[PDB]
From a paper:
[name] (EC 5.1.1.1) is a pyridoxal 5′-phosphate (PLP)-dependent enzyme which catalyses racemization between l-alanine and d-alanine. d-Alanine is an essential building block of peptidoglycan, a critical component of the bacterial cell wall. [name] (Alr) is the sole source of d-alanine in many bacteria and its inhibition is lethal, making the enzyme an attractive antibiotic drug target. Each Alr monomer has two distinct domains: an α/β-barrel at the N-terminus and a predominantly β-stranded domain at the C-terminus.
The individual AlrAba monomers are crystallographically distinct and form a dimer in the asymmetric unit. Overall, the AlrAba structure is lacking clear density for residues 247–263 and 355–356 of monomer B. Missing density for these regions has previously been observed in alanine racemases from other species, including M. tuberculosis, B. henselae, S. aureus and O. oeni. However, Arg132 was not within hydrogen-bonding distance of PLP in the AlrAba structure. The lack of substrate-like molecules in the active site could also be a contributory factor to the unusual position of Arg132 owing to this residue playing an integral role in substrate binding. AlrAba has a hinge angle of 141.6°, identical to that of DadXPao (141.6°) and very similar to that of AlrEco (140.4°), to which it has the most similar active-site architecture.
Author numbering:
A (entry chain A): 1 to 356
B (entry chain B): 1 to 246, 264 to 354
The structure:
């Protein structure tokens, strides 16, 4: 059979979760497992992340998947509910809801007795500048005041727009968050994503929300996972399916975008964009084979790529790493003009998934 | 429930398959349905493409899926088999194999009695300068003349590297192909992909192999599906989940976690009720933002990410790639209607 495989290392997941604990020692952890655990597979990741205090998801359906798999941890719906009829289900399954706008506020008050009797906190989202989701200052203060007076236990929640770099909007957001915290204390609070866990332990408060770092990929353009002491969780592999010796001046692939400047050995590998390996590169990309790095040559097709193996001993069937511990997913991303998060999330169903 | 939806228009599939019949009037059609029908879902495309003479796939698993869905059309494994132990299954399921290198030729000869007795053609792939898979000239002639001698029925097969453009390697590939066919005649022949179907009817021969055109996306960077008279098959949608007055901004329930592409080289757009609206700021994992200043919307309004009104090739061009890739790299999260 064609070999295209996605391996998920459970020990690395445990290790990176433990890194969160080391960096945010006095906070509960909301492990962000949305988008099928950032493409790593919930079935394969939840057990490894079972020491989490909570799991964070993008929608009710992701939360129902967690429950169906047998997991009883608190789950936070990080965008809240999209329709009122989700409220009874959320309450029954013990899913705490983010609220970010008036509509959800009205639905929550409507279901307040059952929601409160289930012991569920409400996460009240601040828009401090991103202008995506949330209540603005000062409206958020009245919302919180009202929820408290209605009998709710609240969590003040914000997300940083640019925690991954040095940016002036980070200070505007920190100060907006502390103003609201001060104004609404006593209150639980949560604002650290992976980047903020590394940079701002003073903002840990009661709950941190790591995502990308759990998966052993970097929240920072200028730091490797080795710099951060994280372990890559996913290895994405395929195999050599053809070998070809070509002469100077011969082209390779669709588009004939690559011309051989000397004679060379080419291997064809059984992966392409139909597996979720990215097509369009803005700098040279490499794969990892036999302890070496080999350049990807010419265009990536739906089902196949070509690599220059002139300098590397290979055979038919030789295993080729597209990313993992030897070719880092964030280096592949950078060559593709994007970020690791996206590569991890846009794999197709064609590769076989294997837990390790 | 969060709304993110993939719709597949069966009538559009049928229309486009008919465009193939119009442009390649006398050939059998191998509909290319690799990669889960270029992302469209084999369950929802094989029926619509049932009039296809054959289906083409990337691997044995994809062909097994076709049979599991109840389809008995001939299937061509377009890269052949990857391990020898695939051969008894290919034979049993009546999958024709490409052979492109010596290893596969050896495994085929080893299973000749059963393969021939099953009535299965062998598609012998020529490498004429694309430099991906294939036997070279003159080595391919030997392979073919041996297979004929063993009683196999052959198809001479080739793929164009640059059929989408004007390019001299197209002529080199053509002339090599014709030379090999002449030497090995009479012989069944196949070389046209979507671009080739549009451009070179003289090279249709016995089997044409439409892929992208079936789905109503363009094989040509410089031509729209309207120019080509193809109907978009996939509509990809989500809904407005929040509205903010800053401009009026709508937040939409799609992101790169759904397969909506993140990184753009120029301004992208969505369509709402047929009207283009700009995407603003960055695409996150679960959400995008759109400028609705000129456009009357509500919470819950359905937003077209691509389909008939925002063309997938336009989105792809803004993302620095081609439609094929976008169709292929959707996540499991959106509901397939």
């Amino acid at each position: 059979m064609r070999q295209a495989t996605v391996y998920i290392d459970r020990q690395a997941l445990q290790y990176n979760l433990n890194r969160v604990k080391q960096l945010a020692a006095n906070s509960k952890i909301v492990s962000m497992v949305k988008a099928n655990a950032y493409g790593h597979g919930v079935k394969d990741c939840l057990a490894a992340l079972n020491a989490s205090d909570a799991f964070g998801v993008a929608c009710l359906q992701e939360g129902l998947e967690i429950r169906e798999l047998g997991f009883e941890q608190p789950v936070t719906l990080i965008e809240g509910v999209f329709s009122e009829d989700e409220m009874p289900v959320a309450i029954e399954q013990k899913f705490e809801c983010v609220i970010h706008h008036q509509q959800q506020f009205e639905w929550l008050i409507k279901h307040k007795q059952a929601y409160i009797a289930q012991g569920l906190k409400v996460w009240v989202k601040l828009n401090s500048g991103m202008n995506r989701l949330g209540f603005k200052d000062p409206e958020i203060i009245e919302v919180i005041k009202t929820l408290k007076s209605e009998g709710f236990t609240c969590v003040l929640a914000m997300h940083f727009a640019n925690a991954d770099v040095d940016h002036p909007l980070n200070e505007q957001q920190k100060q907006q968050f502390l103003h609201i915290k001060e104004t609404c204390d006593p209150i639980l609070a949560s604002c650290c994503n992976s980047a903020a866990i590394f940079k701002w332990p003073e903002l840990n408060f009661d709950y941190v929300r790591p995502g990308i770092m759990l998966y052993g990929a970097s929240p920072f353009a200028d730091k490797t996972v080795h710099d951060l002491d994280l372990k890559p969780v996913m290895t994405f592999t395929a195999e050599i399916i053809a070998l070809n010796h070509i002469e100077a001046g011969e082209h390779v692939g669709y588009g004939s975008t690559f011309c051989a400047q000397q004679a060379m050995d080419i291997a064809i590998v059984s992966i392409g964009y139909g597996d979720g390996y990215p097509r369009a590169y803005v700098k040279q990309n490499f794969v990892a084979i036999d302890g070496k790095l080999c350049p990807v040559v010419g265009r990536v097709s739906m089902d196949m790529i070509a690599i220059d193996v002139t300098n590397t001993q290979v055979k038919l069937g030789t295993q080729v790493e597209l990313w993992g511990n030897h070719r880092l997913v964030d280096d592949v991303a950078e060559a593709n003009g994007t970020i690791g998060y996206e590569l991890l999330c846009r794999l197709s169903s064609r590769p076989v998934r294997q837990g390790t």
